[PDB]
Amino acid sequence: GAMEGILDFSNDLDIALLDQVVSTFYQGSGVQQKQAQEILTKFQDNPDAWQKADQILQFSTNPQSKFIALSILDKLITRKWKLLPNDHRIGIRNFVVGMIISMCQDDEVFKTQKNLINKSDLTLVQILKQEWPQNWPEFIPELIGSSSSSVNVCENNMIVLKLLSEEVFDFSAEQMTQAKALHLKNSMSKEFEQIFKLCFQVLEQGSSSLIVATLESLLRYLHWIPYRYIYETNILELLSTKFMTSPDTRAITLKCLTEVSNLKIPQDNDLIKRQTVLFFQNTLQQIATSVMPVTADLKATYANANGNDQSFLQDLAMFLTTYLARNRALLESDESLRELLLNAHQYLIQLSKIEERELFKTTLDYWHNLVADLFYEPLKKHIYEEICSQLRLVIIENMVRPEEVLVVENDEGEIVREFVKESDTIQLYKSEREVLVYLTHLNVIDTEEIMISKLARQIDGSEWSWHNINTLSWAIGSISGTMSEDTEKRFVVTVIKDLLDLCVKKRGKDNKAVVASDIMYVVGQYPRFLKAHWNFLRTVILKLFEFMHETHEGVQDMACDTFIKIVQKCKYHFVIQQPRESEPFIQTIIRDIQKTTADLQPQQVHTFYKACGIIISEERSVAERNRLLSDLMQLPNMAWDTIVEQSTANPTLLLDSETVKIIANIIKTNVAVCTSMGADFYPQLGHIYYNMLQLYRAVSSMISAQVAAEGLIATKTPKVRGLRTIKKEILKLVETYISKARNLDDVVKVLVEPLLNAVLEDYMNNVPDARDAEVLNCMTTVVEKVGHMIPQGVILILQSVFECTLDMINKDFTEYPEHRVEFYKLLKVINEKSFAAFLELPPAAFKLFVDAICWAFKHNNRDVEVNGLQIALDLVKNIERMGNVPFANEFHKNYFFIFVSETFFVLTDSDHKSGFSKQALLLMKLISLVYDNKISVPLYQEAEVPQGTSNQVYLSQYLANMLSNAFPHLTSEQIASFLSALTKQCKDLVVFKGTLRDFLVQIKEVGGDPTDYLFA
Amino acid sequence: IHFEPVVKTMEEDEEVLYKVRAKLFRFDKDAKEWKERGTGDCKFLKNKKTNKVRILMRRDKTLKICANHIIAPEYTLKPNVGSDRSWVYACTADIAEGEAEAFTFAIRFGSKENADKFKEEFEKAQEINKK
Amino acid sequence: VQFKLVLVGDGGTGKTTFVKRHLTGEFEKKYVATLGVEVHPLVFHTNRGPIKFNVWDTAGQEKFGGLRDGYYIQAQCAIIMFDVTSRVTYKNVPNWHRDLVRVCENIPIVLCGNKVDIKDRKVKAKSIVFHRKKNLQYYDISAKSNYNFEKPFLWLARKLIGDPNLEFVAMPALAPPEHDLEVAQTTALPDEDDDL
């Protein structure tokens, strides 16, 4: 293409062609934009492209061309600056400074080319980071001098200083060594008095854009400057009065005052206290007179979203909440400051009515901070009684749907079951509940009165709406635990009586669904009440059972969830015989279980059975418990027994899709009950166990047969997915039981051998796509719980899953994601609980183990990566614990340097930043092994180095070589100093990590200072 | 004395024969894989003036059309190897993304029941489009 | 008629997946790293007429960054993306924000925490506060489940058009007019476990 001409550096640069490529990129579209983009990227990445920058800057008629020229220079300056000969450095600095001066002096350019100028200023700042103050000591005095000369130049200087303060104080942590950052912080600190003088002068003398630029720079300084600059000058007065009045400066001044409300400031000093009160007082008076009174409808203002109102309101909220959180104590004692305190809070009340979730969270965080303080601090709550009373209203009327309420309104005005969970309101609900709980404790009478009377207006119909009955109901449920049992008694009674009244009066299925969701939520939130009112509890449950036959699927699902919620708390009352009842309610429930659950979806049936298991485990007498368990299991066990008889006689019957569903639901029912009963489930497990393992084998044969007959595509078919579900649920059941078992001798004597026999060879001898990841998961739990008791079984597990699973996952990082994850979990527990199993591996298999570990920590998957690093660490500890024996000596000779170099590789490649902490920990461990002479053999083979030589000397030599070849742009000195520091710091993780971070900075550039590694 | 008081979907002319939630896929031939095209309500729309019946499907929230084509009599609903709750069929003239393009579609439902109800209703609409 | 939107954030946070979801409806499971920038027009129909975003989906991997902040010139709005399963991605949000606002000084910006579908969330909701002092809108999203997937564009359109009550509306639906099928039949539909 014509456009590709700029890529030939053997020919002189056609600036007109560059400008065309650039225009085509930014202003073009389609294929031409795409071609032009590639060309510009190739151009920009040419390691000589920077030599063209002056030419472009001088001759280009295109601002974007010149921007791109400045990016090319920025890259040179931040990575290879110290490579250049000194006259190129001076030359680059001169034409950058000169371009800035020149663009500022031409007003039309200043007005219209802001992007370019800002980019120039950043480019200058990158030069300062390299050169200042050591090779540019007059930069600041001269900048100050230049400022007075022109208003455009002065404005721009403020931008330069803002960017410099940012680069040095706010963004230096990740981008500079500790030593260099300190250097630059000290340098800026030493010159600040003169910068401040210029700043204050500009602010005092009052052009609006110059003032705004100066205030934006001040905002940055407030992050770090000494407090005397803020409190001992007249700057607070200016900020809180003059700069609040004009809307041009008001936005940034408010942000400055928010930062000021955070300065480090003495706690005993009465004058500073007076000044902190005064700036707030001024600020609030300016808002009231220039912006809006305390009575103004901010909800409405925000919704209108005129001009910059939303951001202003956001900023006011941040200012008020920040200031009051630190300083409201200053305003609480003096009666003359009371009006200010209460007005500031009244603004917050108004801000809290705004419909904007993220803003609500900001204000709510502040309310929590306040109400928590009022709960504990003597003599405070009365000050805020009216603020609190208003807050009670705001929270109650803006309560968000809790996770339990499964009905929602659709766009068609129908109350439907939710499609998905409102995952993003979980936390908001919790925060709202927390505040409302405090508010209720602060005045329980006020809260009752607000709620009961809001309810009154729902019955009578005056405020009736779904929105209003909902938030009220959620609010009411949310304060459970805040009242005395006795007041709670009367309160709940009142609320429930009224919600019942409400239901009767509300014709239609959408109304009934809303009101039923609300009643179910409230009753489920008050178990203390339920435990005290048996007739009521029982009638509630019978009613939940009625809802299990509802055609409205939202109500039905909620009934199930509410049933288990109530049972989790009230289970004792279902297990005993209540006065004046003929049997424990659990007996009544079990008996009618087929009727009750007839219309439920299977997973709802399983939840039901799980609830019953919770009750049954309350019975501690073993004979009675087991009988309850076998009663509960009657229907699944009868279905099971006929399935087993049929299946054994003819394996074709297992073929049927309907039978496969039936079997899966049987096992799932067992899982559900086992989950709630844990160790108490054993007798039921015993009833099915041997036949269940026979079923696993039968199903396994069917799956293999189908894959042989239809191909791998078989694994996608509904038939085969149905058969694997059986296998997975069987593994889940066994896993669930073993994870909770208390009799481990029975696990080992009775459960394990048949389990291993049934699952391992089957897993091993299946094609990869037919292998179930859940086998590995099951085996992890087995090793976790009883691995120490079954050393030979652990050997068998490794033999069966290790090599074949590794070969599935060692081609790339993406295939078989579940296997990958379960595989490293299993290796982790084996390494932790039955290390002997690895000691028994043949040498080739052990190498693959080491390979597997190193492969793990090259993953970007966190699941895997984290386990890989932990295994490596645990492995080193395991080797170490063996002491001076041949296996350990051989492990070091073979593997110490593989681990060191592999760990360095992931530390330094920039694609494994999430693992830094654990990587650093592993490296420190490995280095400390040599430092402390815990390696008993030479790591070096003999004649590689003199006979008496130490591993410490050899380790340094090995590392210096490794690093010299991996990072050839580093000097020898840099490498030596880095290694000296790292080895010295190998007992102090915090410092050790700083040194690693410093190295990661230096490898990104040329000519880093080796003395940086002496930082302390 | 009277006081003066203070001061298009294109589905307007159609009858909704049938509505069901669905996920729609299209088969990318070059890479042999299905790609999701949308999730939402799949509607059978019978035009009051022509008695002709179309499939119209819009994505949740954005309400963008992901299917708009006549339920052709020549079309046939086929099972997919992986599913007991989907149909695959070839469509020669879909106008969801502008100009009429041919596609192989797959449409999946919440249950086998819904898939079966869909097919029944799909063949009913084919007969209507015959008359 | 038309607005330049730049999309920035760490590699693997789901920028391209999110954009594709909006463009074609699809969910791309593979991670193919963006090289510099991919530009895509994206139109929404609203009660105030059509709005077109020209979406500059930029590269998050440093090695593939291309023109970097050169991409942001004349951006009229932005999305900053992170991944709630990866803490380093939230940690770097201030870095993306800094580079962006240095070029685009007064534009509406949405911060999106993607992948909220993943059970094991690492960036706690409570932790997410960077947007507050920077005046960014924030949303939990998932390109995979479509959780809040429309909100970032609906918010930006309201800001750009200057209309708080702007809504997405149904686009008009015009009257509509070989071993290729067997392959389609015998290629399994993805995610057969899903609700739909």
Ligand SMILES: *[C@H](CC(=O)O)C[C@@H](O)/C=C/C(C)=C\[C@H](C)C/C=C/C(C)=C/[C@@H](C)C(=O)[C@@H](C)[C@H](O)[C@@H](C)C/C(C)=C/C(=O)O
């Ligand atoms: C709509 C009903 C309608 O008629 O329109 C939906 C509604 O049925 C949903 C109801 C739900 C989920 C639960 C109710 C609250 C269960 C009913 C329990 C009930 C009537 C218990 C009786 C035995 C009872 O205890 C009555 C006599 C009491 O008055 C209580 C309502 C209050 C109490 C416990 C007073 C006390 O203990 O002193």
Ligand SMILES: Nc1nc2c(ncn2[C@@H]2O[C@H](COP(=O)(O)OP(=O)(O)NP(=O)(O)O)[C@@H](O)[C@H]2O)c(=O)[nH]1
């Ligand atoms: N679970 C889940 N995965 C997602 C989601 N969004 C994207 N992904 C996955 O995340 C990976 C990376 O997505 P991609 O869009 O390529 O990321 P990107 O931010 O564009 N990366 P780059 O900046 O390098 O171009 C893909 O494997 C994709 O399927 C989500 O919401 N949930």
Ligand SMILES: [Cl-]
């Ligand atoms: Cl420019």
Ligand SMILES: [Cl-]
């Ligand atoms: Cl109890």
Ligand SMILES: [Cl-]
């Ligand atoms: Cl040297």
Ligand SMILES: [Cl-]
């Ligand atoms: Cl960055």
Ligand SMILES: [Mg+2]
């Ligand atoms: Mg991408």
